[PDB]
Amino acid sequence: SEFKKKLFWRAVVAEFLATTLFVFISIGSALGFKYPVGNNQTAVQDNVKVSLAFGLSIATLAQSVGHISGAHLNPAVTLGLLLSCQISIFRALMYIIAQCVGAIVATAILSGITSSLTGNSLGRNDLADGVNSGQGLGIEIIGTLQLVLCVLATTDRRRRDLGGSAPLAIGLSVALGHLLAIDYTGCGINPARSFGSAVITHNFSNHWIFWVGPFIGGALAVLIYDFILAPRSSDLTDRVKVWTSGQ
Amino acid sequence: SEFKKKLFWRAVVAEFLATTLFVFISIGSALGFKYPVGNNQTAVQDNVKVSLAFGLSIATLAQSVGHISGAHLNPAVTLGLLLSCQISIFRALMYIIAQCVGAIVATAILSGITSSLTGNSLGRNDLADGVNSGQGLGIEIIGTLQLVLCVLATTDRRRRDLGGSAPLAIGLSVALGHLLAIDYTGCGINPARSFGSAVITHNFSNHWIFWVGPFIGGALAVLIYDFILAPRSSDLTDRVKVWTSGQ
Amino acid sequence: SEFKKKLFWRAVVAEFLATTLFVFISIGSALGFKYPVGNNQTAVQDNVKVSLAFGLSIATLAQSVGHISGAHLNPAVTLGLLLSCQISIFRALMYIIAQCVGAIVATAILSGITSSLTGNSLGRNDLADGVNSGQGLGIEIIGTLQLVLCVLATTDRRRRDLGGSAPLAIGLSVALGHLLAIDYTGCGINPARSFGSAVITHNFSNHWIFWVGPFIGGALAVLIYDFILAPRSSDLTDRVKVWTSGQ
Amino acid sequence: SEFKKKLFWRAVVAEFLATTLFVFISIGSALGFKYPVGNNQTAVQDNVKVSLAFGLSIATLAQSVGHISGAHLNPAVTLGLLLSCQISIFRALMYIIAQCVGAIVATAILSGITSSLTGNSLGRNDLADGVNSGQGLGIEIIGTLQLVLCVLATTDRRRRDLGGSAPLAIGLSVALGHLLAIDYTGCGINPARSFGSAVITHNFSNHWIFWVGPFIGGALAVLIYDFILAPRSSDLTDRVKVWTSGQ
Ligand SMILES: CC(C)CCC[C@@H](C)[C@H]1CC[C@H]2[C@@H]3CC=C4C[C@@H](O)CC[C@]4(C)[C@H]3CC[C@]12C
Ligand SMILES: CC(C)CCC[C@@H](C)[C@H]1CC[C@H]2[C@@H]3CC=C4C[C@@H](O)CC[C@]4(C)[C@H]3CC[C@]12C
Ligand SMILES: CC(C)CCC[C@@H](C)[C@H]1CC[C@H]2[C@@H]3CC=C4C[C@@H](O)CC[C@]4(C)[C@H]3CC[C@]12C
Ligand SMILES: CC(C)CCC[C@@H](C)[C@H]1CC[C@H]2[C@@H]3CC=C4C[C@@H](O)CC[C@]4(C)[C@H]3CC[C@]12C
Secondary structure (H helix, E strand, O other): OHHHOHHHHHHHHHHHHHHHHHHHHHHHHHOHHHOOOOOOOOOOOOHHHHHHHHHHHHHHHHHHHHHHHOOOOOHHHHHHHHHOOOOOHHHHHHHHHHHHHHHHHHHHHHHHHOOOOOOOOOOOOOOOOOOOHHHHHHHHHHHHHHHHHHHHHHOOOOOOOOOOOHHHHHHHHHHHHHHHHHHHHOOOOOHHHHHHHHHHHOOOOOOOHHHHHHHHHHHHHHHHHHHHHOOOOOOHHHHHHHHHHOO | OHHHOHHHHHHHHHHHHHHHHHHHHHHHHHOHHHOOOOOOOOOOOOHHHHHHHHHHHHHHHHHHHHHHHOOOOOHHHHHHHHHOOOOOHHHHHHHHHHHHHHHHHHHHHHHHHOOOOOOOOOOOOOOOOOOOHHHHHHHHHHHHHHHHHHHHHHOOOOOOOOOOOHHHHHHHHHHHHHHHHHHHHOOOOOHHHHHHHHHHHOOOOOOOHHHHHHHHHHHHHHHHHHHHHOOOOOOHHHHHHHHHHOO | OHHHOHHHHHHHHHHHHHHHHHHHHHHHHHOHHHOOOOOOOOOOOOHHHHHHHHHHHHHHHHHHHHHHHOOOOOHHHHHHHHHOOOOOHHHHHHHHHHHHHHHHHHHHHHHHHOOOOOOOOOOOOOOOOOOOHHHHHHHHHHHHHHHHHHHHHHOOOOOOOOOOOHHHHHHHHHHHHHHHHHHHHOOOOOHHHHHHHHHHHOOOOOOOHHHHHHHHHHHHHHHHHHHHHOOOOOOHHHHHHHHHHOO | OHHHOHHHHHHHHHHHHHHHHHHHHHHHHHOHHHOOOOOOOOOOOOHHHHHHHHHHHHHHHHHHHHHHHOOOOOHHHHHHHHHOOOOOHHHHHHHHHHHHHHHHHHHHHHHHHOOOOOOOOOOOOOOOOOOOHHHHHHHHHHHHHHHHHHHHHHOOOOOOOOOOOHHHHHHHHHHHHHHHHHHHHOOOOOHHHHHHHHHHHOOOOOOOHHHHHHHHHHHHHHHHHHHHHOOOOOOHHHHHHHHHHOO
C-alpha cells in the first residue's frame, strides 16, 4: 500500500535529507571548539553550545519537514511511534534505514570538511572515564525516555490544550537530553547519529549501548504514555492493524 | 469523590513519574562537570547548563503530563494551587507525597549511576560561603514567588489573551529561578528535589530553608495574584468547598 | 477619570511589584558569580547567564501581569507607548514612578541579601574601559530602540498574523539587548533598573546616559513604527485625546 | 506597478532599517569580549553569546517588520524566495541593495563605536586556520541551506499545522547556523552581513565564499523544498509571472 505512493517516498527522502542536515550541523558544532588547528589553546568543549546545536537542529528540521515525514530523525522516536501503533512496520524500517544512511553520509562529509584535525573522532559516542556500561546505558535510557515521551505527548491528537510550537518542544527535549548526557556518554540518544560516527571512524566499541538504551527508553515511554497515564479507548487488535496498514 | 476516580490516580502517578524524570535529568546534568574522573582538571560548573536543564526538564515534562495531572512537580506550586482554591486537600497531599517519593527514587538511581564521584553531594542544596540562613531564605522566597506567580497567572482561565506554549513559560520561569539561585543556595525552590538529595546524602543541615522559603514564596504569590492583582468575584465560602470536593 | 478606578491602581501596583521582582532577580543573577566569597577564584562573569536572566525575567513577569498592567516594566517602553498614544499621561507618570520605586526597593533588598560582597556595585551601570559617553550612549540607544520597536509591533492590535507568546518575544528582545550591551555598559536599557542601583550605591557618575539614551531609542522606535513602517490613518488631533482620556 | 506603491517602498525601508539593526547588534555583541580595553585578560569568545545575539536579533526584527516586508534581512533568503517565485525580481533586487547598504551603515557606525579596539576586524568573516576554501564553502552552503529551508517551510501558507512564533523559528535557525559555523568561518550565512564588514575593513580575502556558498545553499534549499519534498500544484508558467507582477 505505502510502497506505491509517492507521498511515502517523499517522506522517506525528507527523513534522509533532514537527518543528514541534523547530523552534519550538530557534529560540526561538536567539532567546532578544536579550531583553529595551529592555535595551541586550552580550548574546552562548550556543553551548552553542543546541546543547543542538536536541539535547535531538531527544532528547525522538524519545522521544515514535520508535515512531510513526521520529523522523526531518530530511530528511537520512530520505534516509539511504531510501538504506539501510529506508523506501519514498513514506514518504520524505511525511516530507520534513511536515518542511518543520512547520518553516515553527513559524517563522511564532516570527515572531509574537518580533515585538518588530527585525532578526529567525528563526535563518536563513547563512555567517559568513570562511567561503565550500566551507568551509560541508564543515561541513554532516561534521555531517550524523556524524548520519546515528549514526542508521544505532543502528537496525541486528542489534546485541545496544546499551544505553541511542537517542533520547538521536541527540539528543547533533545537539547535537554544533551544537557543531561553529554558529559557521561556524549549523548548518543539517537542510534543513527552514533552509528554514522561509528561507521566512519571504524570504531564500534561499546556501540551496543547506544542502540539498546535508546530503544529501551522509547519502549518505556510508550508504556508510560499509552498504558499508564493517557490510555486510548481502542482495542489492541484494531491498533495492531496499523502495522500492516499504516492507518 | 476523587478517592474513587481512576483519573485522579493517573494524575498522581503522572506526578510521581514526571518528578522522578525531572529530578534525575536535572541533577545528572548538574553533576556532569565532574566527569571525567581520572582527568585532573579544574573544571567549573556551568550555571547556564544547569539552569537550562532544570527549565527544559520542567517544560518538557509539563508538555508530557500537564493534560493528565497539571504537571505541578513542585510542592510549592501544589501548595499555591491549593491556597488559590483550584485543587482539593486530598489531591495536594497525594501530589506532595508522589513528588517527594519520586525525587527520592530519582536521587537513589542517580547516586547509583554517579557512584564513581568521590564525595558526591548529589546536587544537595546548601548555602554558599557568605550567605547565611536569612539571605538564602530570601533568595528562595523570591524564586518561588516568581515561579508560583507565573503558574497562577498562566492557569487563570479568565484570560483569553494567552498565547504560545504554557509549558515553555513555566519551564523558563524555573530556569529563571535557577539563573538566580544557583550561585547563592544551589537553587532549591523545589522542596521535593531538595528533599530527595537530603535523604540520599543523609544530610539535612539548613534543610528547613528549602521547605520554608518555597512555601512562603508560594503563599505570597497566591496573595499577590488572588487578592491584589486579579481578584475573583466569588465568596470565600464557595471557594473553600473546593478543598473538600475537588471541583 | 482613571484616578477613580480600582483597575488602574491594580495595574500600577502590578507594575511596581513586577519591576521589583525583575530588578531583584536579574541583578541578583548578575552578582552570583562572586560567590563563594571565601574562595579566591578568578571566576569570570557569564554574559549568557545574565542576559538570559534579564530576558526570562521580563518574559515570566509579562506572562504574569500583562493582562493586568500591560507589563511595561521599563520607563523607556512606557514613554514609547505614550508617544505612540496608547496610554494616558497620568498612566505613564504613575507607571514610571512605580517602576523607579520598585527598582529602588529591589536594589535595597538585594544589597541586604548580598552584604557579604565587599565593594558591591549592585550591578551599577557604567561605561567600560575604552568606551566613552558617546559610544555607550549609542549602544544604549540601539538596544532600547530595538526593544521599544518590538513592544510597539507586538501590541499593534491591527495585526492578525501575531502568533506564539508575546511575553517570550519581549523577553527575548530584552535578552538580546543585554547580549549586545553587557560588555559595553552593563546594558542599562531600562532607566528605572539603572536608577535603582545608582540610588542605592549613591553613585550617579555617567548616569545621564541611562536616562537619555533609552528615551532617545524609544522616541526613535516610535518614529520608525508609527510614521515610517506601519502608519495609522488617524488624525494627530484625535490621537492627542488619548493622553487625557486613555481610550 | 510595484515601483509606484507606498507599501513596496515601506517594505524596502523596513528591510534596510532592520538589516542595519541586525548587523549592528549582532556584530556589536561579537566584539564585546575584547572589552575592557585596559584590562589585560586572555578573553575567549563565547559562541553561545554571539549565536544567540544573531538569532534573537533575527527573531526580534522579524517580529517587528514581518507584516511590512516579510523580514528577509538576508540576500540568500531573498534570493531563495525569488527562486521559489514568492516575490518579484524588482523587489528582490531592491531588498538586496537595501540589505547591503544597511549592513555597510551598521558596520560603519559600529566601527565608530568600537574604535578603541586595536586591529579591529569588525567581525569580518574569514577562514579559520585548518579550513581551506572548499571546507568553508561547504560549511556556508549547509548553514544557509538549513536557514533557507526553514524560511521556505515556515512561510508556506498551505500549512495549517504551524503553531508558535514564525519569527522565533527563523531566529532559532539563524542561531543554529551560527552555532555551527562561527568556529569555522565566523558564520557568514548572510552575504550582506559579510559584505558590510568586508567593505568597512577594506579586506575581501576569501570574500567570494560568503556570497557564493549562501546562494548555493539557498538554491539547494529551494530545489529540496519545492521539487523534492513539498511540490506545488501549479505550472511553472503561472509562477514565473510573479517575477514581473509581484502578485
Ligand atoms: C531508571 C532505570 C529503569 C534505568 C537505568 C537503570 C540501570 C541501567 C542502572 C541504574 C543503577 C545502576 C547500578 C547502580 C550502581 C552500580 C554499582 C557500580 O559499582 C557498578 C554499576 C552498578 C551495578 C549500576 C549498574 C546499572 C544500573 C542498574
Ligand atoms: C520577600 C521577602 C520575604 C524575602 C527577603 C526578605 C528577608 C529574607 C531578607 C531581606 C533583608 C535581609 C536582611 C538585610 C540585612 C542583613 C544584615 C546582614 O549583616 C545580616 C543579614 C541581614 C539581617 C538580612 C537577613 C535576611 C533579610 C531579612
Ligand atoms: C544612529 C545614531 C543616532 C546612534 C548612535 C550614534 C552616536 C551616538 C555615536 C555613533 C558614532 C559615534 C562617534 C564615533 C567616533 C568618535 C571618535 C571618538 O574618538 C570620540 C567619540 C566619537 C565622536 C563617537 C561619538 C558618538 C557617536 C556619534
Ligand atoms: C553537501 C554539499 C552541498 C556541501 C559540501 C560539499 C563540498 C563543498 C565538500 C564535501 C567534500 C569536501 C572535500 C573533502 C576533502 C578534501 C581534501 C582536503 O585535503 C581539502 C579539502 C577537500 C577537497 C574538501 C573540499 C570541500 C568538499 C568538496
